[PDB]
Amino acid sequence: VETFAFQAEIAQLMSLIINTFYSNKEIFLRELISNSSDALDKIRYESLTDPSKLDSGKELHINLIPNKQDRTLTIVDTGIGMTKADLINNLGTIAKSGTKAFMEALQAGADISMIGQFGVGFYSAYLVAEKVTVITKHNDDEQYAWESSAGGSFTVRTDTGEPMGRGTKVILHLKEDQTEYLEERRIKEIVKKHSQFIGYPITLFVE
Ligand SMILES: O=C1OCC/C=C/CC/C=C/C(=N/OCC(=O)N2CCCCC2)Cc2c(Cl)c(O)cc(O)c21
């Protein structure tokens, strides 16, 4: 297991998301579904020029899996996934400009729900989660687990859990007072409100 420090501005964004008083937390689900949709668009796009990219799985979909016993909400997609370099470096690098644009916009009157307009909507997960684990598999690399409870650092390790073929699984370890996002009717409401036109099937698993 390797420990990395977030780029400073990203550590600052996560402190802001964690510490700002902001009741409209439900948007985190829209943002992560949107990220899954964008990851699915990428492998679909690349597959048109190279059909061998779907050898790791043709199905393009999103599953929502709540688990009251683990207090986890898991978003699973079969999109393009992330390499080790993606996890540690690339996405963080890309997110620098968006994080700065976002912080400035919040200075000028925007609110937290607008985060996804800046390409950094993943960090809205920390509105509801004390810890986030991401398992991912990209066609060009092995399976990895990334994890952070914020505080300025994250870790990455090889994952030898059940193999996933290709894609990303985001595991939201929910804060004690956010267990409403484990409820079936709450999840349906929010998907209906915010993610009505996503062009992949979203399956809400029940308990
Ligand atoms: O694999 C994913 O994107 C790969 C293709 C890129 C698509 C554009 C949408 C952005 C998505 C993401 N931005 O990450 C922000 C980030 O630095 N870190 C650290 C590494 C762990 C993931 C979060 C990662 C991602 C997220 Cl977050 C997701 O909820 C679903 C996903 O399928 C993917």
Curated annotation (Swiss-Prot):
Post-translational modification: ISGylated. S-nitrosylated; negatively regulates the ATPase activity and the activation of eNOS by HSP90AA1.
Location in the cell: Nucleus; Cytoplasm; Melanosome; Cell membrane
Modified residues (N6-acetyllysine): K42, K68
Binding site for ATP: N35, D77, K96, F122
Subunit structure of this chain's protein: Homodimer. Identified in NR3C1/GCR steroid receptor-chaperone complexes formed at least by NR3C1, HSP90AA1 and a variety of proteins containing TPR repeats such as FKBP4, FKBP5, PPID, PPP5C or STIP1. Forms a complex containing HSP90AA1, TSC1 and TSC2; TSC1 is required to recruit TCS2 to the complex. The closed form interacts (via the middle domain and TPR repeat-binding motif) with co-chaperone TSC1 (via C-terminus). Interacts with TOM34. Interacts with TERT; the interaction, together with PTGES3, is required for correct assembly and stabilization of the TERT holoenzyme complex.
Similarity comment text for this entry: Belongs to the heat shock protein 90 family.
Domain notes: The TPR repeat-binding motif mediates interaction with TPR repeat-containing proteins like the co-chaperone STUB1.
Protein name as catalogued: Heat shock protein HSP 90-alpha
Organism encoding this protein: Homo sapiens (Human)
Shown chain mapped onto the complete sequence: 17 to 223 of 732
